[PDB]
Amino acid sequence: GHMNITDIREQFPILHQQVNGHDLVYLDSAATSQKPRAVIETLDKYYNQYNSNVHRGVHTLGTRATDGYEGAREKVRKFINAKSMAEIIFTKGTTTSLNMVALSYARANLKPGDEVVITYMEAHANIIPWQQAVKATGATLKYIPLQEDGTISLEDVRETVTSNTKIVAVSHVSNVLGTVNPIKEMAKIAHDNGAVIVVDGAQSTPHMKIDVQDLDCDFFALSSHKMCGPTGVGVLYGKKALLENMEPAEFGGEMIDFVGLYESTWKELPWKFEAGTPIIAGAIGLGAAIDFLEEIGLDEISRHEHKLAAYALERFRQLDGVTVYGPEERAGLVTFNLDDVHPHDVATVLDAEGIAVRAGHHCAQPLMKWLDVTATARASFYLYNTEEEIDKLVEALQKTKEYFTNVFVDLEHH
Amino acid sequence: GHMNITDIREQFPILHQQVNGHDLVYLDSAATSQKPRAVIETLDKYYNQYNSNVHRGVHTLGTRATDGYEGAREKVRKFINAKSMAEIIFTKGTTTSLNMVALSYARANLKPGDEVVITYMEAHANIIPWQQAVKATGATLKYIPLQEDGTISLEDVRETVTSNTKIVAVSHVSNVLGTVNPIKEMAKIAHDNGAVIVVDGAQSTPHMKIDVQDLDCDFFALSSHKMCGPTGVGVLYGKKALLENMEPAEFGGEMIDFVGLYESTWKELPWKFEAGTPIIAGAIGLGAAIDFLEEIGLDEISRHEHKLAAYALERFRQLDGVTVYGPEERAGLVTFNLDDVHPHDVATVLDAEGIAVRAGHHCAQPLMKWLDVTATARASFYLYNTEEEIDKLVEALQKTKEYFTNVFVDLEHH
Ligand SMILES: Cc1ncc(COP(=O)(O)O)c(CNc2co[nH]c2=O)c1O
Ligand SMILES: Cc1ncc(COP(=O)(O)O)c(CNc2co[nH]c2=O)c1O
């Protein structure tokens, strides 16, 4: 109970506005999160006081910028409990990190007969890179089936992963079902079969503590914009032994050692995988966001979101004609559908009430077809959301149902 | 004479500080530029008022964020005089744009016997991607020789580019020599031989007007951090007909149309080449930087930098034992070396005087070996730099020479 939601909301200026005459109710944090004053003012101080190119150590502003950038790297390492800063690569997001794994590891380690194993609930960022990799290498793509409640059975994992499996790619938390996957046990299974494991942690990292040494994940991808950090920056973590043997996905300055006319040698880790001028301000702001979240406490955020999710599930079960997808035990989000109402109209009406939710396929079309739906609505929570906002959401959903029912009965009257 | 340098400097808060007790003299804009209040406050307003994920059009903040992002795209299109927004791809920088060209165009259009033609003055971002592409395709890499003053002869271009040349990759302006290359004539030559042309415009775009239709460049890469914009964002321009036939370099959400279990289809341009959540705030800030530069006028900035460069060249010629590299007609930078003093010590002493210059190889090792030097110093100018700062630079260089000469004569005395 260490968490004061009023004091937390006071740090996010964007929450204190009205939309369509109604107080803003932002329930779309799984799409992107909002930023506290700490992060915005960190970007401000960088651009106002010590912006310069990094990795030169020549003048004072350059030294300060380099110190900020590499200190943010160390902050990330501590945040996910990685062994070394050499295992922390700054990218532009989760998607780019997964693409780097698929390019530099998969396409170099896949032979005909090899298997890449994913799940039906994966977002598109954790699907199409593997599709392209197996198409380029002539390998085989396989899918772990899902249970009736949208969870993954460990026996299904043991059945799908075989001696020919080299890569198992799975999300830590589903951005649609809210499912928390058994990443540690799946990693043990993949290693038992001689495969590596690649964890999509875009949805888990902002909301729960990450320990890559306890997870024993071989790769782990995360996105800054979902965890109160700036846009356009993310992290690829990989075990140092694996990253040492992988060739770079991008080539250019800053990642080189010697450059001949036709041949070149690369820098050591992690700079081998960071070509060109890096995302300096964004990485420093991600470090600031990590400081913010850690001072609040990721366990506290997790418990707050558990309370929010249980409350939301109970209040959704109080609504007639509403279908919620996923398991009971879940992260802080609810994907649903109103009977007789397309989710786009639901979210339009909700925005008219000032409530921001997402409508569509949520970048998971195979999962949508597994759910036998064309689209869904989704309300997602974070550390600044309250139970009163969920009350507003469910009241607006009831009003939406009533409104569309009575629009139906008047046009039938005609 | 429309340019008031005092009013311009008033917009950059980072310039108004002291380093080591001396007023800051920032002459390292070729490494990275500083930002005006317009850009920083644009980022501030985004994160404070309408941050949300884009390309959904579902709630109001999302619509505002999408409008800002795509409006920044249109601003870029107008800025470089591209025909269509479909030809404007947001990347994380020039290096990534050139790597995308090398991955999606070069590696798909190079056969054994084909030629990729570059120059000795290219930065590493415009060298190593082509090295890797020709190594992957078994093609051949060739270099256009340079004149005695660091310029490129059009006859040397016609000699190097042949009927087997498919790609000519060249920088618009050298970040070391200050040379402005004849990009339009080289494009005509490359097209005459059946090749496309890829322009590295990282150093030209911030300081001179770009017209890709007059240049007739097939690809053009630029970086936001060098043109008063945020870090971690850049642009790849490509002719629409070429981009339509190129496969994506990255795969994931937002760039897809249909996603099956094993096959996928891509979005139309430009979103085909933008996977995952884009660099929303950075792109909007780049649009703000474009607004700033265009209200000042790129021709005015170019003339101011021409005045600065002529003044700096004359004052450098007044110094004994100083070697300047490159031609007389040049962009706004001076790369040089002090006799008997390593450039790292030069730049250390200069930072002790509050002057920020760069020392090293400037990501151009083949050029350094062509210059028969191991490292150089470089002072680069932008719209906020004055002639008084160049006076401070040359006075500090004279003081540095005297200091090292008399440190030499006292240790010889011993
Ligand atoms: C589980 C998961 N993986 C990967 C990604 C992609 O991350 P990015 O590269 O930073 O974009 C997302 C973002 N998912 C969503 C973005 O918008 N709505 C969403 O549900 C995600 O939720
Ligand atoms: C001509 C040229 N091309 C490409 C690049 C790479 O751009 P980036 O991807 O945004 O990093 C640079 C940056 N050149 C320099 C960066 O620092 N010092 C420099 O001289 C450049 O000057």
Report the 3 state secondary structure along chain B: CCCCHHHHHCCCHHHCCEECCEECEECECCCCCCCCHHHHHHHHHHHHHHCCCCCCCCCHHHHHHHHHHHHHHHHHHHHHCCCCHHHEEEECCHHHHHHHHHHHHHHHHCCCCCEEEEECCCCHHHCHHHHHHHHHHCCEEEEECCCCCCCCCHHHHHHHCCCCEEEEEEECECCCCCCECCHHHHHHHHHHCCCEEEEECCCCCCCCCCCHHHHCCCEEEEEHHHCCCCCCCEEEEECHHHHHHCCCCCCCCCCEEEECCCCEEECCCCHHHCCCCCCHHHHHHHHHHHHHHHHHCHHHHHHHHHHHHHHHHHHHHCCCCEEEECCCCCCCEEEEEECCECHHHHHHHHHHCCEECEEECCCCHHHHHHCCCCCEEEEECCCCCCHHHHHHHHHHHHHHHHHHHHHHHHHHHC
- CA torsion B127-B130-B131-B134 (nearest 10°) is -160
Who among B48, B125, B279 is closest to A253 (CB)?
A: B125
Ligand 2 centre to CA of A276 (Å) is: 7
Q: CB distance B123–A253 less than 8 Å?
A: yes
Backbone angles phi, psi at A409, to 5 degrees: -75, -20
Angle value at C-alpha A57, between A278 and A242, nearest 5 degrees: 50
**Coil vs helix vs strand at A83:** coil
Of ligand 1's atoms, which has the minimum distance to the CA of residue A95? 9
Integer Cα distance of A250 and A144 in angstroms: 31
Is residue B362 within 6 Å of ligand 2 at its C-beta?
yes
Instruction: Concatenate the DSSP letters of all residues of A150-175 into one string.
Output: S---HHHHHHH--TTEEEEEEESB-T
Q: Where are the domains of chain B?
A: 5-28+298-413, 51-295
| Alpha carbon of B47: minimum distance to chain A alpha carbons (Å) | 7
Is residue A171 within 6 Å of ligand 1 at its C-beta?
yes
Integer Cα distance of A83 and A215 in angstroms: 13
Q: Can you identify the CATH homologous superfamily of domain B5-28+298-413?
A: Aspartate Aminotransferase, domain 1 (3.90.1150.10)
Which chain A residue shows the shortest CA-CA distance from B126?
A: A252
Q: Is the dihedral of CA A59, A60, A61, A65 positive or negative?
A: positive
Select the residue from A39, A55, A92, A262 to test the B interface by mutation, using most B Cβ atoms within 10 A. A92
Establish whether B228 is a catalytic residue. Answer: no
Ligand 1 centre to CA of B355 (Å) is: 44
Task: Quote the tokens at residue B304.
Answer: 């101011």
Q: CB distance B250–A99 less than 8 Å?
A: yes
Ligand 1 centre to CA of B276 (Å) is: 7
Q: Assign domain B51-295 one CATH number from 3.30.420.80, 3.30.470.20, 3.30.530.20, 3.40.640.10.
A: 3.40.640.10
Catalytic annotation, residues of A:
363
> B245 Cβ partners below 8 Å, 6+ apart?
none
- Of B363, B366, B373, B395, the active-site residue reads B363
Q: CB distance A223–B53 less than 8 Å?
A: no
Integer Cα distance of A239 and B309 in angstroms: 49
Residue type, B7: D
Task: Quote the tokens at residue B19.
Answer: 């380093």
Backbone region of residue A151 per phi and psi (left: phi > 0; alpha: psi in -120 to 50; beta: other values): beta
**H/E run at residue A240:** helix A240-245
Integer Cα distance of A215 and A195 in angstroms: 15
Task: Quote the tokens at residue B63.
Answer: 């619509």
| Experimental determination technique | X-ray
Angle value at C-alpha A52, between A48 and A56, nearest 5 degrees: 155
| Residue position matching structure tokens 């501030």 | B44
Integer Cα distance of A218 and A85 in angstroms: 15
Q: CB distance B40–A35 less than 8 Å?
A: no
Burial class (CB in 10 A: 0-12, 13-18, 19+), B52: buried
Who among A19, A124, A281 is closest to B231 (CB)?
A: A281
Nearest CA-CA partner of A337 in A277, A369, A379, A298: A379
Who among A31, A94, A131 is closest to B264 (CB)?
A: A131
Residue B163: CB atoms within 10 Å: 9
Angle value at C-alpha A107, between A80 and B218, nearest 5 degrees: 100
Based on C-alpha coordinates, what's the Rg of chain A? 23
Of ligand 2's atoms, which has the minimum distance to the CA of residue B173? 1
CATH number of A5-29+298-413: 3.90.1150.10
Q: How many CA atoms lie within 13 A of A253 on its CB side?
A: 25
Is residue A119 within 6 Å of ligand 1 at its C-beta?
no
